[PDB]
Amino acid sequence: MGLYRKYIEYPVLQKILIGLILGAIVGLILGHYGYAHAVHTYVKPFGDLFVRLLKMLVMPIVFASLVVGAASISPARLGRVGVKIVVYYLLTSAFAVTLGIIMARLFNPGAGIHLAVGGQQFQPHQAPPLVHILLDIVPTNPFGALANGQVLPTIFFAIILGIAITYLMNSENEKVRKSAETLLDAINGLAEAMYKIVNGVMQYAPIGVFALIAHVMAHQGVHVVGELAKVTAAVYVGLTLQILLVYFVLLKIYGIDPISFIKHAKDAMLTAFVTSSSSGTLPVTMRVAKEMGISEGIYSFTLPLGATINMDGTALYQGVATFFIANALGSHLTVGQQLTIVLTAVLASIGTAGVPGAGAIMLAMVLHSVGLPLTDPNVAAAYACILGIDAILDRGRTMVNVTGDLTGTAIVAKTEGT
Ligand SMILES: N[C@H](C(=O)O)[C@H](OCc1ccccc1)C(=O)O
Ligand code: NA
Ligand code: NA
């Protein structure tokens, strides 16, 4: 029990990074001496178990999180300040995904990698016309969409259902109000239960990543050190442009001096880089906002909300990650699929999920909507590759997420003062 206990409190992301390094080394050593059949027969089934567990948790989270999230920012309860801050959060998230897509075009990640896990390349599906893509957002049967794997139709039904519940809770009838509260509590309980299961699965992630990487390297000796460096460079350069080309421009437009803003907010960014948690730095963010002179009534509402639904760093990462996987498999993304990435990433941020390791679940949502199933051996291999280096990228993502929260509060405060 002592050895098992020591395995738990070790950070999950660092454990996943360790599994990636040893998996590559073990696969190369075994493959040089043969033993490719042994790795395929025995090591591979452990990796297949991990992806099956990860895919099982996707659909219940999609429905439950969006229903609860949409109820919190429903128009029935949003004030004048709430409306303005919500618009800013959604617009900035939309441009973050687009910026990440552009960076993936300049630096091609995984272009040199050619993945044939089973001996055959990935076969993409046919692209429907653009007009049909827009219409299929509305599901003809909400139960059928849940039974199947339509992510976007499920999101559409969950959002409108959550908004309608909030209007029922303002009704004059006592019975109607009680029925609405009971339904919301049951759906909220389902979301909380899913997060507990996510914590357990992520503890098995280092074992699953080790098996997937070892199987790939044993069969073929692909070089990934250079390619994983390019995806790291694309993410960090994109994060820098997000601050300079968006936050600095918006502050200049609204009259806030960008130089003074950075000096006051430097404490929040450093804490975000070290702790690598948005909720952990919330007390520090509140103190920084008070120093700038923002009224207590404003930042006491915007800052707690921003830590949940405003994530510019995560949105940019999802754009780069999707192109890396598609390039590695040799497929191409059409304009209809690229717009699906932007629409899915922005809408999924509304869902209330703060459990660590939820970034992997979010990436699986985007891949499934585009048309890259996680059960495919080629997709799973590429997915485990970029998941291994998640420890390095996490520090940069958290800093941008916190910085965007402070920028929105300052802009809203200036408008209220006028
Ligand atoms: N760590 C980041 C943060 O807390 O701001 C960020 O948060 C985790 C998260 C939670 C839910 C959905 C997406 C991402 C991440 O790691 O991707
Ligand atoms: Na945003
Ligand atoms: Na944030």
From Swiss-Prot:
GO cellular component annotations of the record: plasma membrane
Mode of membrane association: Multi-pass membrane protein
MF GO annotations: amino acid:sodium symporter activity; chloride transmembrane transporter activity; identical protein binding; L-aspartate transmembrane transporter activity; metal ion binding
UniProtKB keywords: Amino-acid transport, Cell membrane, Chloride, Membrane, Metal-binding, Sodium, Symport, Transmembrane, Transmembrane helix, Transport
Segments on the Extracellular side according to the record's topology features: 31-41, 104-121, 219-230, 321-337, 373-391
Main localisation: membrane
Transmembrane stretches, start-end: 12-30, 42-62, 81-103, 122-160, 197-218, 231-251, 298-320, 392-412
List of residues binding Na(+) 1: G306, N310, N401, D405
Pfam families: SDF (PF00375)
Annotated GO biological process: chloride transmembrane transport; L-aspartate import across plasma membrane; L-aspartate transmembrane transport; protein homotrimerization
InterPro entries according to UniProt: Na-dicarboxylate_symporter (IPR001991), Na-dicarboxylate_symporter_CS (IPR018107), Na:dicarbo_symporter_sf (IPR036458)
Effect of S65V: Strongly decreased chloride conductance
Sequence positions that bind Na(+) 2: T308, T352
Entry note about domains: Contains eight transmembrane regions plus two helical hairpins that dip into the membrane. These helical hairpin structures play an important role in the transport process. The first enters the membrane from the cytoplasmic side, the second one from the extracellular side. During the transport cycle, the regions involved in amino acid transport, and especially the helical hairpins, move vertically by about 15-18 Angstroms, alternating between exposure to the aqueous phase and reinsertion in the lipid bilayer. In contrast, regions involved in trimerization do not move.
Family membership: Belongs to the dicarboxylate/amino acid:cation symporter (DAACS) (TC 2.A.23) family.
Record's subunit section: Homotrimer.
Protein's recorded name: Glutamate transporter homolog
The organism of origin for this protein: Pyrococcus horikoshii (strain ATCC 700860 / DSM 12428 / JCM 9974 / NBRC 100139 / OT-3)
